[PDB]
Structure 1
Amino acid sequence: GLAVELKQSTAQAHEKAEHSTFMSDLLKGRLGVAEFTRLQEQAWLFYTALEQAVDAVRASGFAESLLDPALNRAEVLARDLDKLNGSSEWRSRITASPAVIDYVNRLEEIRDNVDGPALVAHHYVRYLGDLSGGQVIARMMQRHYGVDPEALGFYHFEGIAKLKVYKDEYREKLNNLELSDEQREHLLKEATDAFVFNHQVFADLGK
């Protein structure tokens, strides 16, 4: 099934992400809320782009049931950032890191090409990760740095009750997508690239 092949083909990349110096240090308590806020600022940039691509692909009629708007993170992230930074001044201060420029550019290509299989790869890499492991990240930000849960809205998924069920249903939708061999290969390759972009975001944050 596609859900298994996605997980298997990116498992090593996921381990690599876990072991990133920046993200590792953040989750171990060695950094602080400032660095967490820098991460979330970069995330706002790439989630904004991702959600434009999701919107385009949803409108095309591809993977509709998968592309649940309840998953949208950009607006929630903006509210988190208003809290983390104390005002909305971050909007004019923030700049996309080189990593984020590449990631956003790719997302804009997917949006404008209305490339459904590529979009689904990106959707899986970000949202299933958020749904599945986000609670661990949120917990660590609360534990090590005292971040208020009200500033961790990104991790909450308002609108979803039974999360396990939601995850299982998400995987079933992946498995039920109609894809050619070319589309499936493209989707798998793109998921790998999605991990690569996300790792580099961490690498750039560390610099």
Structure 2
Amino acid sequence: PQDLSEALKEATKEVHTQAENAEFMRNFQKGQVTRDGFKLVMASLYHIYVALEEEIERNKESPVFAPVYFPEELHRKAALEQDLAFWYGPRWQEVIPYTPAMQRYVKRLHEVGRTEPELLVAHAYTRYLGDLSGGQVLKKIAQKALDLPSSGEGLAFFTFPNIASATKFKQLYRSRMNSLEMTPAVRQRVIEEAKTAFLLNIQLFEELQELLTH
């Protein structure tokens, strides 16, 4: 479509559906998810966000990203750090897994943020808006499947405290995206990257399923 936020949504509808149907993901939604499986996803999210957020902090000033820089409303590293301390304990940083699929997603994120930051938005959109959209559902699922204690910890990731209305925020984010100024050449690179980001998630899910079935 015309608006970037639309072109993105439409250009990734296919890969997005593949993501949904990925065995691991498909099972998660079907309510079937183990703690180890859940821990693997959380550990993955931590790594991905740590990388993504580092790159965002590096290019926040650039015009290629500034318009969609919403640190307070979206940052997840800290939330994830709280959750992993709960899921893996006080030395989670020294025990959480860091698999190849994860490693590869991180690598691309740093590649983008270092050499082609104009593509960073493709990842911020993919991750933030995706997690913001599916967050409420997935939470209740793992909340019902895992049956965690009353510790009052472990799921901070599913709550963006600095965002009152997900809907209104998404509207604002999309708008800032469409306001993002880029040449058509770049716009196409951003679209591709978004498909890449999905693929990366897909590879990731597939690898986790593989690890779990063993």
Correspondence for 2:39: 37
Correspondence for 1:142: 143
CA contact (8 A) 1:118 1:190 kept: yes
CA contact (8 A) 1:117 1:184 kept: no
Tell me, in whole angstroms, the C-alpha distance in 1 between the residues paired with 2:190 and 2:80. Answer: 27
Query: How much is the aligned-residue C-alpha RMSD, in angstroms?
Result: 1.5
What's the TM-score once normalised by structure 1's chain length?
0.93
Residue 83 of structure 1 pairs with residue 86 of structure 2:
yes
Ranges in structure 2 where 5+ consecutive residues have no aligned partner? none
CA deviation digits over 1:16-60, x for unaligned, max 9?
111111122223232312210111101111110010111111133
CA contact (8 A) 1:33 1:147 kept: no
CA contact (8 A) 1:56 1:111 kept: yes
Structure 1 position 184, deviation (Å)? 0.2
Correspondence for 1:205: 208
Residue 60 of structure 1 pairs with residue 62 of structure 2:
yes
Q: Residue type of the partner of 2:81?
A: A
Tell me, in whole angstroms, the C-alpha distance in 1 between the residues paired with 2:110 and 2:12. Answer: 23
Structure 1 position 94, deviation (Å)? 2.5
Give the stretch that moved more between structures: 74-83 or 186-195: 74-83
Tell me, in whole angstroms, the C-alpha distance in 2 between the residues paired with 1:60 and 1:147. Answer: 42
Ranges in structure 1 where 5+ consecutive residues have no aligned partner? none
Give the stretch that moved more between structures: 157-166 or 119-128: 157-166
Give the stretch that moved more between structures: 185-194 or 88-97: 88-97
Matches within 5 A, 1:131-170: 131-147=132-148, 150-170=153-173
Q: Residue type of the partner of 1:143?
A: K
CA contact (8 A) 2:68 2:177 kept: yes
> 3-state SS of the aligned residue for 1:96?
coil
CA deviation digits over 1:121-176, x for unaligned, max 9?
00010000011111111121112222466321111001111221101111111111
| Number of residue pairs aligned between Structure 1 and Structure 2 | 205
Residue 194 of structure 1 pairs with residue 197 of structure 2:
yes
Give the stretch that moved more between structures: 25-34 or 115-124: 25-34
Tell me, in whole angstroms, the C-alpha distance in 1 between the residues paired with 2:8 and 2:175. Answer: 13
Structure 1 position 15, deviation (Å)? 1.1
Q: Residue type of the partner of 2:199?
A: V
What's the TM-score once normalised by structure 2's chain length?
0.90
CA contact (8 A) 1:135 1:155 kept: yes
Correspondence for 2:123: 122
Dislocated runs of 4+, deviation >6 Å: none
Give the direction of change, closer, same or farther, for the CA distance of 1:121–1:128 in structure 2 (3 Å limit). Answer: same
CA contact (8 A) 2:65 2:120 kept: no
Residue among 177, 181, 184 paired with 1:178 = 181
Give the direction of change, closer, same or farther, for the CA distance of 1:117–1:54 in structure 2 (3 Å limit). Answer: same
CA contact (8 A) 1:80 1:152 kept: yes
Q: Identity, % of aligned pairs? A: 34
CA contact (8 A) 2:40 2:97 kept: no
Tell me, in whole angstroms, the C-alpha distance in 2 between the residues paired with 1:157 and 1:31. Answer: 23
